[PDB]
Design a protein around this ligand. Structure first.
Ligand code: ZN
Length: 349
């Protein structure tokens, strides 16, 4: 029994962090890729985490399975398709899924990811394949799906390509640009490559979100809002450390993409303190509930609702409230956004 058995909206979940272990296993053996384990259960046991890990340990989780998907057209399209199915099972009616097109390519991309051999899959084609999988999935599972392309903090050189891809495939699921990766990188938010890609997003009407304040200080949040001119914040928990910034963001109705289960497992949140989502609730902040990386966290969207319901006393009124706000803060055209809202209103009333 779901904690909130009603239609839901999810705005922060990574496609490369939401793959079925069986599918990883299928493609691993299909092209002779070495995987740590040969069974689904032990594979998620290895890939998943039950306790906070060092950043290196965390990032290494990806090294274990991404090589089996990246560079393979069939696989890129398939994980996108299966992703929509997963969300349908979660009772999600609208989802914005994000990922780095570069981390799935083996052609172009100077720093060829995952130590894979030079191939023939460019970031551009990756995007088209994802689009196809997501659209076929929308048709087959009844979930409205849009995507977001991720700039990687440690690779500013890819950021311009990211924004141009968002422009090229606009509406065809791509609705925004994101900035993900290691936030502890000093001045990463200020890297010219990232700043210019976002300045261009503003100029081309590409919506914007940025991972900030998850583990970094309130200062990375401030840089995301004032310099990158982000419209939403991924996590943004450390905004509570700069009261004036927090209050300005509340005044501006800034949207916070919260991932409760994730924040716990990663350690972004210390169990000894009030969870940010609790005060955001008390402060009536504009925020959403999200899984982030279901595969790595061994979770489903219900995991985050069960946690806030049972361990934080969230009411159905708050769940309805936050999903309405998630829809209001979506990067959907105003026309479709209103339709999504009408669905939620009728479903919540
Ligand atoms: Zn994320």
């Amino acid at each position: 029994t779901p904690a909130f058995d009603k239609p839901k909206v999810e705005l922060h979940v990574h496609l490369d962090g939401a793959i079925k272990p069986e599918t990883i296993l299928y493609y691993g053996k299909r092209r002779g890729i070495a995987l740590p384990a040969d069974t689904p259960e032990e594979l998620q046991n290895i890939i998943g985490m039950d306790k906070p890990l060092t950043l290196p340990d965390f990032l290494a989780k990806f090294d274990y399975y991404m090589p089996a998907i990246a560079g393979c057209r069939d696989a890129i399209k398939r994980i996108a398709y299966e992703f929509v199915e997963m969300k349908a099972k979660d009772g999600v009616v609208y989802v914005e899924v994000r990922y780095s097109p570069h981390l799935l390519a083996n052609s172009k991309v100077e720093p060829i990811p995952w130590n894979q051999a030079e191939g023939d899959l460019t970031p551009d084609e990756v995007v088209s394949l994802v689009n196809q999988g997501l659209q076929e999935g929308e048709r087959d599972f009844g979930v409205k799906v849009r995507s977001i392309l991720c700039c990687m903090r440690h690779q500013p050189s890819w950021s311009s390509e990211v924004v141009e891809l968002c422009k090229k495939y606009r509406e065809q699921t791509v609705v925004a640009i994101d900035l993900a990766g290691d936030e502890t990188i000093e001045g990463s938010s200020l890297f010219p490559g990232h700043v210019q890609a976002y300045a261009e997003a503003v100029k081309s009407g590409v919506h914007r979100t940025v991972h900030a304040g998850e583990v970094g200080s309130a200062n990375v949040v401030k840089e995301a809002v004032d310099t990158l001119k982000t419209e939403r914040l991924g996590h943004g928990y450390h905004t509570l450390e700069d009261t004036t910034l927090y209050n300005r963001l509340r005044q501006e109705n800034m949207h916070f993409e919260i991932c409760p289960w994730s924040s716990y497992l990663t350690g972004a949140w210390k169990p000894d303190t009030e969870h940010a989502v609790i005060r955001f609730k008390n402060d009536q902040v504009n925020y959403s509930l999200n899984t982030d990386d279901p595969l790595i966290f061994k979770s489903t969207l219900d995991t985050d609702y069960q946690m806030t319901k049972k361990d934080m006393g969230f009411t159905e009124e708050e769940f309805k409230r936050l999903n309405i706000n998630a829809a209001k803060s979506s990067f959907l055209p105003e026309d479709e956004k209103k339709e999504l809202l009408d669905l939620l209103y009728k479903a919540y009333r």
